[PDB]
Design an enzyme around this catalytic site. Structure first.
Site, mmCIF file in Angstrom:
data_model
loop_
_atom_site.group_PDB
_atom_site.id
_atom_site.type_symbol
_atom_site.label_atom_id
_atom_site.label_comp_id
_atom_site.label_asym_id
_atom_site.label_seq_id
_atom_site.Cartn_x
_atom_site.Cartn_y
_atom_site.Cartn_z
ATOM 1 N N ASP A 104 27.706 -13.025 -1.999
ATOM 2 C CA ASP A 104 26.740 -13.863 -1.319
ATOM 3 C C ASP A 104 25.753 -13.049 -0.437
ATOM 4 O O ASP A 104 26.171 -12.145 0.313
ATOM 5 C CB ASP A 104 27.507 -14.815 -0.440
ATOM 6 C CG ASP A 104 26.620 -15.760 0.287
ATOM 7 O OD1 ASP A 104 26.182 -16.755 -0.373
ATOM 8 O OD2 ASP A 104 26.314 -15.564 1.470
ATOM 9 N N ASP B 98 39.289 -30.503 -4.962
ATOM 10 C CA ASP B 98 40.363 -29.617 -4.488
ATOM 11 C C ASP B 98 40.806 -28.685 -5.605
ATOM 12 O O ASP B 98 40.375 -28.806 -6.753
ATOM 13 C CB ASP B 98 41.458 -30.455 -3.872
ATOM 14 C CG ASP B 98 41.816 -31.662 -4.698
ATOM 15 O OD1 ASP B 98 42.055 -31.491 -5.932
ATOM 16 O OD2 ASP B 98 41.963 -32.796 -4.166
ATOM 17 N N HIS C 206 24.434 -24.066 -7.091
ATOM 18 C CA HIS C 206 24.682 -25.012 -5.984
ATOM 19 C C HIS C 206 23.532 -25.034 -4.988
ATOM 20 O O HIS C 206 23.549 -25.823 -4.024
ATOM 21 C CB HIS C 206 25.984 -24.653 -5.269
ATOM 22 C CG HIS C 206 25.937 -23.318 -4.672
ATOM 23 N ND1 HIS C 206 25.815 -22.148 -5.393
ATOM 24 C CD2 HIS C 206 25.909 -22.976 -3.356
ATOM 25 C CE1 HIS C 206 25.713 -21.128 -4.544
ATOM 26 N NE2 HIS C 206 25.755 -21.627 -3.308
ATOM 27 N N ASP C 207 22.554 -24.114 -5.210
ATOM 28 C CA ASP C 207 21.387 -24.019 -4.380
ATOM 29 C C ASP C 207 20.117 -24.467 -5.033
ATOM 30 O O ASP C 207 19.044 -24.372 -4.445
ATOM 31 C CB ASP C 207 21.150 -22.574 -3.914
ATOM 32 C CG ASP C 207 22.207 -22.065 -3.014
ATOM 33 O OD1 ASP C 207 22.844 -22.802 -2.263
ATOM 34 O OD2 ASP C 207 22.425 -20.835 -3.091
ATOM 35 N N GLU D 236 24.402 -11.883 -5.321
ATOM 36 C CA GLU D 236 23.306 -12.801 -5.051
ATOM 37 C C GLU D 236 22.262 -11.975 -4.280
ATOM 38 O O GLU D 236 22.344 -11.772 -3.080
ATOM 39 C CB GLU D 236 23.755 -14.015 -4.176
ATOM 40 C CG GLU D 236 22.579 -14.970 -3.907
ATOM 41 C CD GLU D 236 22.769 -15.951 -2.774
ATOM 42 O OE1 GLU D 236 23.419 -15.617 -1.747
ATOM 43 O OE2 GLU D 236 22.232 -17.106 -2.902
ATOM 44 N N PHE E 15 37.268 -35.404 -1.549
ATOM 45 C CA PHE E 15 36.879 -34.043 -1.486
ATOM 46 C C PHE E 15 37.542 -33.257 -2.647
ATOM 47 O O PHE E 15 38.815 -33.275 -2.746
ATOM 48 C CB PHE E 15 37.322 -33.505 -0.120
ATOM 49 C CG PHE E 15 36.721 -32.169 0.287
ATOM 50 C CD1 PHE E 15 37.278 -30.971 -0.126
ATOM 51 C CD2 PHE E 15 35.616 -32.109 1.185
ATOM 52 C CE1 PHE E 15 36.820 -29.745 0.335
ATOM 53 C CE2 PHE E 15 35.130 -30.880 1.583
ATOM 54 C CZ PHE E 15 35.710 -29.708 1.181
ATOM 55 N N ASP F 24 38.558 -34.428 -7.511
ATOM 56 C CA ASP F 24 39.406 -34.767 -6.401
ATOM 57 C C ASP F 24 40.738 -35.286 -6.860
ATOM 58 O O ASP F 24 40.922 -36.444 -7.089
ATOM 59 C CB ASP F 24 38.697 -35.837 -5.527
ATOM 60 C CG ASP F 24 39.547 -36.314 -4.424
ATOM 61 O OD1 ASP F 24 40.448 -35.584 -3.966
ATOM 62 O OD2 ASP F 24 39.412 -37.470 -4.010
ATOM 63 N N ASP G 222 41.158 -38.000 -1.382
ATOM 64 C CA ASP G 222 40.467 -37.959 -0.063
ATOM 65 C C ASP G 222 38.922 -37.883 -0.168
ATOM 66 O O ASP G 222 38.210 -37.776 0.808
ATOM 67 C CB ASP G 222 40.978 -36.841 0.830
ATOM 68 C CG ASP G 222 40.675 -35.513 0.352
ATOM 69 O OD1 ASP G 222 40.183 -35.336 -0.772
ATOM 70 O OD2 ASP G 222 40.931 -34.559 1.143
ATOM 71 N N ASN H 288 43.596 -35.526 -5.169
ATOM 72 C CA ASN H 288 44.463 -36.209 -4.166
ATOM 73 C C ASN H 288 43.827 -37.425 -3.448
ATOM 74 O O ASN H 288 44.477 -38.031 -2.603
ATOM 75 C CB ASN H 288 45.071 -35.285 -3.124
ATOM 76 C CG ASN H 288 44.067 -34.835 -2.093
ATOM 77 O OD1 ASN H 288 42.880 -34.983 -2.190
ATOM 78 N ND2 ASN H 288 44.599 -34.247 -1.026
ATOM 79 N N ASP I 231 33.866 -16.015 -4.431
ATOM 80 C CA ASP I 231 32.653 -15.823 -3.686
ATOM 81 C C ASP I 231 32.957 -14.980 -2.517
ATOM 82 O O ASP I 231 33.774 -15.398 -1.653
ATOM 83 C CB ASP I 231 32.079 -17.196 -3.259
ATOM 84 C CG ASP I 231 30.566 -17.276 -3.333
ATOM 85 O OD1 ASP I 231 29.894 -16.356 -2.749
ATOM 86 O OD2 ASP I 231 30.046 -18.220 -4.009
#
Ligand SMILES: [Ca+2]
Length: 559
Positions: A198, A27, A330-331, A254, A25, A19, A23, A21, A96
């Site tokens: 995906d 980026d 990520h899954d 995927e 989240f 992150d 916030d 910046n 993706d």
């Protein structure tokens, strides 16, 4: 020779990577600022999880604009810079491609749903209720409940294999295929080097929408019709002719629903489809085959099952097609917490899984944080964010009562996707150096012990072991191009195999257990001479008999 055969891919989950910046989240400028870290690790390809505009119902996999960024990631200008910065470092970037479905907030769907005469009506899959008002058939969503949601305004249901906010695109409509190809060209013309596709197994539907046959354990069913549709490979071949053949690119699908024969259809070069796919079969060894609780009906780790599954893939794609090699994304939970020891033997276990994987034929994928031995979180259930979990709790625990609360919490603690999604752990300072602000989900409570800063200060780190594996791949062409043979196949602790290429042999021996084990080379190998390339313990080179400590891993090359 193709660059993608020789690559090592690093998968970024960008909302959780860095992150810049403040916030909370992660980026695109954050990613930029950490590219030198990835280059130093050794990866030469980055796969970025989706950063396109999205209401975030499924954390970017619900796209509302294919040609602009979600504002928290940045703008297109930041995306273009990232592509340029990747290239300047001699690396490649894969994006993706999420084209089984869009957000229900995509302009196309907002239009489609207005009226049957809207020009976008047939961009999605709309069907009449049954005569009693119920759903067109008994198909279920992967995120619980029905695959159909009713629209009062037009009197029809729309299809969604995923969330209600992820309506499935209608690939029977040539306009839809053309929209997808134009998205692909937009980004590839701007320097994107390939795609991770995906839920690519789902893009062709059985357009008769037949019900699943049933014996009685569930109302809504997820099964064989949800993948591998009658036009799947026709559509991917058209995608190849219309788009992929025009660029120097990499594709990885995927491939939900894939078995080894399906993988040959996707990946045989003569079919002019994709370069490689992700399968789930090795990730599926620890669920029960077909419980109503799905992925959440867990089984203990069974090394023989893992060996047999991975060997089927290694042999099936040995001389045709190409494998992906992964244990994390990520899954998936962190593999060392799921299937190994993430406490006193964490470093040895992490290096052991790495060795089994990176010694195989195929392209390796390293998921952010795997290289430092990140682990599952102990956070309470109320801190999890994933809609998969929220929806499964309601269906399984509350409504259908096919799992107890205690059983479901335990299962989430092992397999929740959020174990992959807590922020990357950069240092031991506030929020592991991921942000100066408040992170979108809490950092794993173990970060002060498990982070990049400490890993780089420790010559015995998991990081340096990964860096060495990637160097070895670049130095020893047998790692990329050799064949594969499983050895000592029945051993319930040891995963050992042989690669052969141009008269050289690579022996990989890994104890995937917490107890001592013994590897004895088969008779044909007993008079080989070896040099040890890498080990996660201090070592010697008489590989014909190896007394293996817990999680001990060795790779040797013949000399
Ligand atoms: Ca930010």
């Amino acid at each position: 020779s193709e660059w993608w055969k020789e690559a090592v891919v690093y998968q970024i989950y960008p909302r959780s990577f860095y992150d810049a910046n403040g916030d909370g989240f992660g980026d695109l400028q954050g990613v930029i600022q950490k590219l030198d870290y990835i280059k130093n690790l050794g990866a030469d390809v980055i796969w970025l999880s989706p950063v396109f505009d999205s209401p975030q119902d499924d954390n970017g996999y619900d796209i509302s604009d294919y040609k602009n960024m979600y504002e928290k990631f940045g703008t297109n200008e930041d995306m273009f810079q990232l592509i340029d910065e990747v290239h300047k470092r001699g690396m490649k970037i894969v994006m993706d491609l999420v084209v089984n479905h869009t957000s229900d907030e995509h302009a196309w769907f907002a239009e489609s749903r207005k009226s049957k005469d809207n020009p976008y009506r047939d961009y999605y899959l709309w069907k009449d209720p049954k005569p009693d008002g119920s759903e067109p058939n008994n198909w279920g969503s992967i995120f619980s409940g029905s695959a159909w949601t009713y629209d009062e305004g037009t009197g029809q249901y729309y299809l969604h294999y995923f969330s209600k906010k992820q309506p499935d695109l209608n690939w029977e409509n040539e306009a839809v295929r053309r929209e997808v190809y134009d998205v692909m060209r937009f980004w590839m013309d701007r320097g994107v080097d390939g795609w991770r596709m995906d839920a690519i197994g789902s893009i062709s539907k059985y357009t008769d929408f037949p019900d699943y046959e049933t014996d009685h354990s569930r109302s809504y069913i997820v099964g064989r019709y949800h993948s591998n549709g009658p036009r799947l490979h026709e559509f991917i071949q058209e995608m190849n002719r219309e788009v992929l053949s025009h660029y120097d690119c990499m594709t990885v699908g995927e491939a939900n629903g894939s078995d080894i024969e399906e993988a040959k259809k996707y990946t045989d070069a003569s079919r002019q489809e994709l370069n490689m796919i992700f399968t789930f079969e090795h990730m599926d060894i620890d669920k029960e085959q077909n419980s109503p609780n799905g992925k959440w009906q867990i089984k203990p780790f069974d090394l023989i099952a893992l060996k047999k599954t991975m060997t089927r893939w290694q042999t099936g794609l040995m001389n045709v097609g190409w494998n992906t090699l992964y244990f994390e994304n990520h899954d998936q939970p962190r593999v060392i917490s799921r299937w190994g020891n993430d406490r006193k033997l964490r470093k040895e276990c992490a290096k052991a899984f790495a060795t089994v994987l990176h010694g195989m034929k195929g392209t390796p994928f390293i998921y952010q944080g795997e290289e430092i031995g990140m682990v599952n979180s102990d956070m309470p259930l109320e801190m999890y964010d994933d809609l998969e979990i929220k929806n499964a709790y309601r269906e399984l625990v509350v409504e259908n009562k096919t799992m107890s609360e205690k059983e479901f919490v335990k299962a989430v603690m092992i397999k929740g996707r959020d174990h992959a999604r807590t922020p990357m752990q950069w240092d031991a300072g506030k929020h592991a150096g991921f942000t100066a602000g408040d992170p979108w989900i809490p950092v794993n409570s173990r970060y002060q012990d498990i982070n990049v800063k400490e890993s780089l200060e420790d010559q015995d780190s998991i990081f340096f072991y990964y860096q060495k594996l990637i160097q070895l791949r670049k130095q020893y062409k047998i790692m990329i191009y050799g064949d594969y043979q499983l050895l000592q196949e029945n051993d319930p602790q040891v995963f050992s195999y042989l690669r052969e290429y141009r008269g050289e042999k690579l022996l990989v021996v890994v104890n995937l257990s917490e107890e001592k084990a013994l590897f004895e080379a088969p008779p044909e190998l007993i008079h080989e001479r070896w040099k040890v390339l890498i080990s996660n313990y201090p070592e010697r080179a008489d590989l014909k008999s190896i007394s293996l400590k817990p999680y001990e891993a060795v790779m040797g090359i013949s000399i």
